[PDB]
């Protein structure tokens, strides 16, 4: 046990040993970006691949070319924290070495006249952080992986649902990574048609003719030949034995049945058959037959032989005739009938027809047609069947060559045609479109490489255009390359792509789940409305690869998936999952990662299979799965086993205790809502857990993990200094490690990110130990919510539907109080009238509102502010304003007139009260820094001095020097002092950060981990809540009616186990309080940890006295227990745990009504549930408006709480009002509340006068409609 785990050991109720630990959860991001940016000597991945794909750039004439040498990434201007503060992208400069080689015209082509080698700046590449995130414009973002259709060839059918009859129509689609699409389809007349890029169909034979295939060659490729001879004045079939098995058969020695088995007579073996001429009459010729004497073609290819034709060849002396084999079951004339409907007879005609279908309305020339056909599929510039696409193509058509080819050829097209014809005949099957072997994962590295190659092509066009000019004596490579297109491409992808998403940052689990998210949408994917049922379904290949539970509930159902716990992407982008080998009947601890294609062959047992001490299966027939179908299989036929019991579910589903007792519809909700939990003031571990909490806490990156072991030299709320062990020093190293903690930093969802130390000075630490706990972490365990005392009973209708009744104590102990940090900005710009000024001289505002402001007009740090309070004072110059005559008279009476400037200041939003915790001032380079900005600059300089001095002192104390530290401090000073690159016209920016403490209140959303969500209805007094015989009231009362119809029984089991765990914790607390002997404490702890037949062997004898005391202290608030998914605690274990803690075995206590003192007539299930506070707070959702801003064109109220907008009275509301008959209410809604400009002012004045009458007019939207219809040249008018 590690020290952090030794501090609080969680009891494990699992029974199956784990042979494979859960791998790093953020590998799918880090590995992809490493592939992108790392240098590849083989040049197959990333920037090197893109550069070698575009370069060398060759001029059209041949004068010169630009060649690629190498690339490197420079040093970032700012770090991640500095980029987030300033609002800039964290990135590295791309520097590429290129040589412009200029050839000699007089010399033969290829003579190196000159070379010019130089480094070129080719843009700025955004960098991935240590946790798999990007910082774009100061915002943390995650690029989501895509599940797309693999490149290659796919054979499909319409399933007999297009034509009037069944007639199942078959098609084959070739889809590349880049380039046009190729389609081969059957019509209901059994003819083969070709489509290029989804346009008008053409007969398939055309594509063969453009490839130089004669009609006879086509027939030879697509048909077998039955031959005929004239032997001794008799007709001659060449017999193929397999075909025969309506006429009299030859071979008089072995006569077969005549006009009425085959194998017995074929056993002897003859090569001679005699047949009627009528057998020839129906056949179709296979060759073109010419006569030298006549000079004409007696019979053409693909022509039906006739009697006169037979006579003509008889006179011509030809004795052998071959025709095509054609049947109705195994062989078909489809290619012959296609040739019949084909009007093309030569390569040029086919090229011309392809040009007409490509580019209609253009005069076809031979050269243009040839160039078009070459560019469509056989040009590497415009076609790319990628390596994955090539491998899938070759596997489909059974080709074992051209592994590195990226373009189609004759063999590929002909093999696709043959396979489609074969599928029509009956040999072969169509492809499963939703099979995970046909769907590929495309991650950040691939998409970045694609966009970077796009930028490279953009600049390559201009480079070729310039090199074609010729005047290159004074041209250097950096004068040829414009990096702005490449930068535009990369910023487009990283900031405006659909898959570049604003990071989910409510809790660590939200971040981990977001980084492990796979979308079917995005560029090159599906669309929400156009996606069908089949793609949204759970395929049998999702086992161990995609979680069947975690998926968004809504229009996105089935299109967004979560990676499973052990899922991985192979080198080709296909998901694979680990399995344990079964060798010689024993289950080996060797692991093989199998993909969907490889999985189908084998018989794979489940992790629940019983095992013997020798490693083999106990039962003779085991439950396994093969080809996606489950069943019972012999023990000797099992080839693989599942590595873990949580292999099929994702991390969020793996965090749900007793998941096997929950219906999947509710497990979906539980997994989704675990990601919306808001961290609280005090993180509390779950009493009932699954064991994956530590993994999420460590792999999220929110915690501070010891890079090296040692002894904690110094601990503080903001800094941890570790004295490293003597065995783990880099020779000549200071010997200390410094961990600076994040303290009250805003997250993407305006929550609080705070790191709290969990170590003491002098405490030994090993590698991987948790030194500080991030948000929603407790001693290295994920702590999303709080443990609540729960009673399942109705309480006077306050838990009606899904309502939740909460005790006042829960509010008093601040158990669900949350900190929300909000950022506000005041931007002083430059206007035509003048420059906006930030100052405390605010007109028409007294000294009451200026108390919290300083001389510079900015609020003090630590100022408690309420709604409407001024944070930053700002005055905007205003123009001359016309005064009404009454205002002129009022000014004449009282002469005051001070209206030079207008108060446009930053104020706290209404219903927001908090504390100012940070103020930042950004000033444009060349604008005077006010007193406050100078104060912040001095404070930052002093803090940098102090931090550098302390760090230097500790590192020199560990070691036991001026130029290097002076350089570091000079760099820090330059970063602090310099001006800020702000948006044009912006003179100054002041950002104020407000910390708001939000307490639980009616309207807040609370949930468990089983889909049991609800809204708080009442905050009950403690004396009114149900209580037990010992006087302890419950904390939350939940409705028992929500359990049976929703089939989430894991919540009841969790309640029972939580009651047991809290009882055992109370027993431990009692033993500590009475100061019993440590031997008794050890005996009790060992009894607790030995309960059940579990896989955990915790020996308290190996723990020191201080360790036992620490463990007992950490078990005071309840014993944490682990119940893994599908390997959980049985009911017998729960009852034994209840009996140990001296609690009823049924989990039901006798409760009394606090209002009356009377016992409830039945026992009530009382226990402890882990409850969460979701980020759906009534503070952010309560809106109201009477009158406000209006739209510019429609003159209707704006929309949104941010704009103080109004609710939309849609069509269905109008229908409801019409059904009621409320004509006057409807007219109010249409006219005087939305867009009757005169009517709404009159209505406001009437209400102020207390008259309550309206004078409706014409809505402005109708006037707009009239104007647009008139603008369409249509006279629309109103008649009286």
């Amino acid at each position: 046990y590690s020290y952090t785990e030794k501090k609080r050991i969680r009891k494990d109720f699992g029974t199956r040993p784990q042979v494979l630990d859960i791998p790093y959860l953020l590998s799918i991001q880090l590995d992809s970006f490493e592939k992108f940016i790392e240098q590849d000597p083989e040049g197959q991945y990333g920037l090197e691949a893109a550069f070698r794909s575009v370069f060398p750039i060759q001029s059209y004439n041949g004068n010169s070319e630009l060649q690629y040498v190498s690339y490197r990434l420079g040093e970032p201007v700012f770090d991640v924290k500095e980029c987030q503060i300033r609002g800039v992208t964290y990135s590295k400069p791309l520097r590429v070495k290129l040589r412009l080689v200029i050839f000699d015209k007089d010399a033969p082509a290829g003579t190196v006249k000159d070379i010019k080698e130089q480094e070129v700046y080719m843009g700025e590449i955004p960098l991935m952080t240590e946790n798999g995130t990007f910082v774009i414009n100061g915002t943390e973002r995650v690029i989501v992986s895509q599940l797309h259709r693999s490149p290659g060839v796919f054979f499909d059918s319409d399933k007999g649902k297009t034509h009037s009859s069944g007639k199942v129509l078959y098609n084959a689609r070739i889809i590349p990574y880049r380039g046009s699409w190729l389609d081969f389809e059957f019509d209901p007349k059994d003819n083969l048609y070709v489509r290029i890029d989804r346009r008008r169909k053409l007969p398939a034979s055309i594509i063969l003719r453009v490839l130089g295939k004669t009609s006879a060659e086509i027939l030879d490729i697509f048909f077998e030949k039955v031959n005929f001879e004239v032997k001794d004045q008799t007709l001659m079939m060449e017999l193929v034995p397999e075909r025969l098995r309506t006429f009299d058969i030859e071979a008089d020695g072995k006569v077969y049945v005549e006009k009425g088995h085959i194998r017995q007579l074929e056993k002897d073996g003859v090569n001679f058959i005699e047949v009627p001429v009528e057998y020839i009459v129906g056949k179709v010729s296979a060759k073109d037959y010419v006569n030298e004497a006549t000079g004409e073609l007696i019979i053409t290819a693909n022509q039906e032989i006739s009697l006169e034709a037979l006579a003509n060849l008889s006179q011509a002396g030809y004795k052998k005739l071959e025709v095509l084999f054609t049947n109705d079951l195994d062989h078909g004339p489809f290619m012959s009938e296609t040739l019949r409907v084909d009007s093309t007879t030569d390569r040029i005609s086919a090229l011309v027809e392809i040009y007409r279908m490509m580019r209609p309305g253009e005069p076809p020339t031979k050269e243009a047609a040839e160039s078009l056909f070459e560019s469509l599929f056989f040009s590497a510039e415009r076609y790319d069947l990628s390596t994955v696409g090539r491998m899938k193509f070759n596997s489909s058509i059974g080709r074992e060559d051209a592994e590195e080819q990226g373009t189609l050829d004759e063999v590929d097209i002909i093999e696709v045609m043959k396979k489609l014809i074969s599928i029509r005949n009956g040999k072969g099957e169509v492809d499963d479109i939703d099979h995970l072997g046909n769907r590929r994962i495309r991650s950040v590295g691939e998409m970045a490489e694609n966009q970077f190659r796009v930028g490279l092509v953009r600049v390559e066009r201009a480079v070729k255009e310039r090199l074609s000019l010729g005047d290159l004596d004074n041209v250097m490579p950096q004068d040829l390359i414009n990096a702005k297109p490449i930068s535009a491409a990369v910023k487009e992808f990283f900031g405006s792509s659909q898959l570049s998403q604003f990071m989910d940052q409510n809790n660590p689990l939200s971040e981990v789940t977001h980084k492990r998210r796979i979308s079917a949408l995005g560029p090159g994917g599906l669309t929400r409305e156009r996606a069908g049922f089949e793609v949204r379904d759970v395929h049998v290949t999702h086992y161990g690869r995609l979680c069947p539970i975690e998926t968004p509930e809504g229009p996105n159902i089935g299109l967004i998936n979560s990676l499973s716990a052990f899922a991985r992407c192979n080198e080709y982008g296909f998901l694979e999952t680990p399995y344990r080998r079964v060798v010689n009947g024993v289950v080996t601890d060797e692991v093989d990662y199998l993909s969907a294609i490889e999985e189908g062959q084998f018989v794979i047992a489940q992790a629940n299979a019983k095992l013997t001490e020798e490693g083999g299966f106990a039962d003779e027939l085991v439950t396994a799965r093969q080809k996606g179908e489950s069943g019972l299989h012999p023990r000797e036929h099992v080839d693989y086993m599942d590595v873990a019991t949580n292999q099929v579910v994702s991390i969020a589903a793996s965090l749900i205790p007793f998941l096997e007792h929950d219906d999947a519809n509710r497990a979906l909700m539980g997994a989704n809502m675990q990601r919306q939990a808001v961290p609280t003031l005090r993180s509390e571990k779950p009493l009932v857990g699954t064991g994956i909490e530590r993994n999420v806490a460590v792999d999220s990156g929110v915690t501070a993990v010891a890079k090296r072991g040692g002894v904690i030299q110094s601990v503080d709320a903001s800094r941890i200094v570790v004295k490293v062990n003597e065995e783990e020093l880099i020779p000549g190293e200071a010997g200390i490690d410094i961990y600076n903690l994040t303290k009250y930093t805003r997250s993407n969802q305006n929550t609080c990110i705070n790191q709290r130390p969990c170590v003491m000075p002098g405490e030994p630490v090993a590698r991987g130990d948790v030194l500080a706990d991030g948000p929603s972490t407790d001693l290295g365990e994920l702590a999303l919510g709080q443990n609540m005392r729960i009673a399942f009973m109705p309480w006077n209708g306050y838990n009606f539907e899904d309502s939740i009744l909460v005790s006042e104590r829960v509010v008093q102990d601040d158990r669900f109080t949350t900190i929300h940090i909000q950022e506000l900005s005041c931007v002083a710009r430059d206007t035509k009238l003048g420059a906006e000024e930030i100052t405390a001289d605010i007109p028409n505002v007294g000294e009451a509102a200026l108390s919290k402001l300083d001389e510079s007009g900015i609020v003090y740090i630590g100022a408690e502010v309420k709604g409407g309070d001024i944070l930053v004072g700002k005055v905007t110059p205003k123009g001359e304003t016309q005064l009404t005559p009454e205002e002129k008279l009022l000014r004449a009476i009282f002469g005051e007139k001070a209206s030079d400037v207008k108060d446009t200041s930053l104020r706290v939003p209404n219903s927001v009260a908090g504390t100012v915790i940070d103020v930042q001032v950004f000033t444009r380079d060349g604008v005077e820094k006010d007193k406050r900005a100078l104060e912040i600059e001095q404070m930052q300089l002093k803090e940098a001095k102090k931090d550098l001095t302390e760090e230097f002192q500790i590192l020199e104390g560990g070691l036991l020097l001026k130029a290097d530290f002076d350089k570091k401090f000079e760099a820090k000073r330059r970063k602090i002092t310099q001006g800020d690159d702000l948006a044009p016209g912006v003179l100054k920016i002041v950002k104020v950060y407000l910390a708001v403490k939000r307490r639980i209140q009616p309207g807040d959303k609370m949930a468990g981990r089983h889909g049991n969500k609800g809204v708080i209805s009442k905050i009950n007094p403690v004396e009114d809540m149900p209580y037990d015989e010992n006087g302890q009231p419950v904390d939350i009362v939940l409705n028992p009616l929500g359990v049976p119809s929703r089939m989430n029984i894991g919540q009841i089991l969790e309640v029972h186990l939580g009651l047991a765990a809290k009882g055992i914790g109370d027993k431990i607390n009692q033993m500590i309080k009475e100061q019993q002997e440590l031997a008794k404490l050890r005996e009790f702890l060992q009894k607790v940890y030995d309960l059940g037949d579990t896989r955990q062997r915790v020996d308290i004898s190996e723990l020191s006295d201080e360790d036992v005391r620490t463990l007992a202290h950490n078990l005071r608030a309840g014993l944490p227990v682990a119940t893994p998914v599908f390997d959980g605690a049985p009911e017998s274990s729960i009852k034994a745990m209840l009996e140990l803690a001296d609690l009823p075995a049924s989990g039901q206590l006798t409760l009394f009504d606090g209002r009356t003192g009377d016992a409830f007539e039945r026992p009530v299930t009382v226990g402890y549930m882990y409850m969460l506070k979701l980020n759906h707070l009534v503070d952010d959702k309560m809106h109201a408006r009477s009158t406000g801003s209006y739209s510019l064109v429609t003159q209707q109220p704006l929309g949104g709480k941010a704009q103080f907008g109004g609710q939309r009275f849609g069509e269905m509301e109008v229908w409801a009002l019409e059904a009621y008959g409320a004509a006057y209410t409807l007219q109010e809604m249409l006219t005087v509340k939305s867009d009757d400009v005169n009517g709404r002012t009159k209505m406001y004045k009437n209400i102020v006068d207390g008259n309550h009458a309206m004078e409706p007019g014409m809505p402005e939207s109708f006037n707009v409609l009239l104007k647009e219809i008139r603008s369409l040249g249509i006279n629309i008018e109103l008649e009286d």
Partner: protein
Amino acid sequence: TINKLNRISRQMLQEMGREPLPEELAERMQMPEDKIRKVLKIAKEPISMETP
């Protein structure tokens, strides 16, 4: 003036590897920095009202 500012900014971006600040562009253009800022903000096309 706008086009030649763009050309000079592209050459300086190639030269130093980072975006040219307005004072450096002003020095290379032999024009005041205020004129550079004027040219900079008057060289932006109107945004569409249909932009999401």
